[PDB]
Write a protein that binds this ligand. Structure first.
Ligand code: HEM
Ligand SMILES: CCCCCCCCCCCCCCCC(=O)O
Length: 407
């Protein structure tokens, strides 16, 4: 079989579902970086992908992703009881009270940033979100962040996710940003352990710095650093979803009115933004033993990818997935496998994103501010979603003019 890495990279979000569509199947065999790969889509496929008796993550992450997006030694690369113990550390951070606290900090940082946006006249909304997110998440996590360093640190965190998948010198910047962010986070962990940094007992950096593994040993400082960055970086990546919130408000008739007057609408709206827009790329695992499924062979060791975007657009589940319709979530049964913008299955027993509560809370803050507080003009621009970009974004980055918050 031919290597299809280039075709995938040219259409990273839609390649799998388009090929599935052509074959009339929810799975097909392909090859990426010269490695045979079964590509899966849909709720039934997601349920098998999350069966940890059939799939493992250890050794499955391509080195280039380790050197940019994720780091090395983090929870994403663990299996079994080692994984579940590490995953508990992240899950303990996500209490309703703590999630609310981060959302409040973010609202405050967004409001603090507005005067600067007004003074600029014209802004690229996406570009402006990374710093307020960085400031909020650092404060929340007990990470000191001097005012004069916040801009630079926000740029480094952005590079980890925004420049990692760029086929350009930007990827090299992502690699340098990873080296810098790991070293910075390690100094934070070291300071906490030495008692020179006074992070609170409820904060992420404290929890991670003092986490004991299954042998009652502290994480090595590098691993602790990577895990701390696994809180900081993806919180900054919410800039992408906030940009999509602004995009939906701009391009979908009736949405703004519904959000303004119907209090229960915001929850439905944020979920539909997660369903509708591409963001999370396909997740990778490896078959842990020989099995067969739906007439497809999964030999032990076979690389397997789960298409999140395609699953979120599966007509069997949604009927009319092509339409942006928040109302559809009134009929959702909260199934753990059929709606998977940040993974499927169970949070404790699998690799599902622990950041979902934070993402939902911050997206609701964004939707609230964009319809009830923040006034802005939207000049003529290319708002179409760039499906060739990782992460995907409106081509313009969502340009605003005349931004103020006295409305
Ligand atoms: C910004 C939008 C986000 C998207 C699109 C996203 C998506 C995902 C996806 C697809 C996975 C992998 C699921 C799997 O491997 O089966 C994941 C895992 C993870 N996410 Fe997120 N996430 C986001 C935000 C967050 C936030 C805000 C946090 C932390 C505060 C976070 C922390 C993590 C961690 C630590 C993992 C690894 C969990 C594990 O391996 O057990 N994510 N995320
Ligand atoms: C060309 C080399 C490929 C590089 C790998 C591309 C990975 C970038 C993916 C961007 C999606 C962003 C989703 C957030 C992920 C996270 O924060 O953990």
């Amino acid at each position: 079989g031919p290597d299809e890495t280039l075709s995938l990279l040219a259409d990273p979000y839609r390649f799998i579902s388009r090929q599935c569509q052509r074959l009339g199947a929810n799975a097909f065999e392909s090859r990426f970086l010269l490695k045979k790969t079964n590509c899966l889509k849909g709720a039934k496929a997601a349920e098998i992908f999350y069966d940890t008796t059939r799939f493992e993550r250890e050794g499955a992450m391509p080195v280039a992703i380790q050197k940019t997006l994720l780091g090395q030694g983090g929870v994403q690369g663990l299996d079994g009881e080692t994984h579940r113990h590490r995953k508990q550390m992240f899950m303990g951070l996500m209490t309703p009270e703590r999630v609310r606290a981060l959302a409040q900090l973010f609202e405050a940082e967004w409001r603090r940033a507005v005067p600067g946006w007004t003074r600029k006249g014209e802004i690229v909304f996406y570009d402006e979100l990374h710093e307020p997110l960085t400031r909020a998440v650092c404060a929340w996590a007990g990470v000191p962040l001097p005012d004069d360093e916040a801009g630079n640190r926000a740029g480094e965190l952005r590079a980890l996710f925004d420049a990692a998948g760029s086929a350009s010198p930007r990827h090299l910047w992502s690699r340098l940003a990873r080296r810098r962010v790991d070293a910075w986070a390690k100094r934070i962990i070291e300071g906490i352990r030495a008692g020179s940094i006074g992070s609170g007992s409820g904060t992420a950096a404290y929890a991670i710095a003092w986490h004991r593994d299954r042998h009652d040993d502290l994480l090595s400082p590098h691993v602790a650093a990577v895990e701390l960055v696994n809180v900081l970086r993806p919180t900054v990546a919410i800039a992408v979803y906030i940009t999509f919130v602004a995009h939906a408000l701009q391009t979908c008739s009736g949405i703004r009115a519904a959000l303004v007057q119907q209090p229960d609408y915001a929850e439905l709206f944020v979920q539909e933004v997660r369903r509708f827009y591409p963001f999370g790329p396909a997740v990778v695992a490896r078959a842990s033993q020989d099995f067969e499924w739906e007439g497809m062979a999964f030999p032990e060791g076979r690389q397997v990818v789960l298409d999140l975007y395609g699953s979120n657009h599966d007509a069997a589940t949604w009927a009319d997935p092509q339409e942006f319709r928040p109302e559809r979530f009134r009929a959702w049964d909260e199934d753990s496998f059929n709606f998977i913008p940040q993974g499927g299955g169970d949070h404790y027993l699998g690799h599902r994103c622990p950041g979902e509560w934070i993402v939902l809370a911050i997206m609701k803050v964004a939707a609230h501010l964009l319809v009830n507080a923040m006034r802005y003009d939207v000049p003529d621009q290319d708002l179409s979603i760039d499906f060739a970009r990782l992460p995907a974004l409106p081509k313009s980055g969502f340009v605003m003019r005349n931004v103020h918050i006295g409305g």
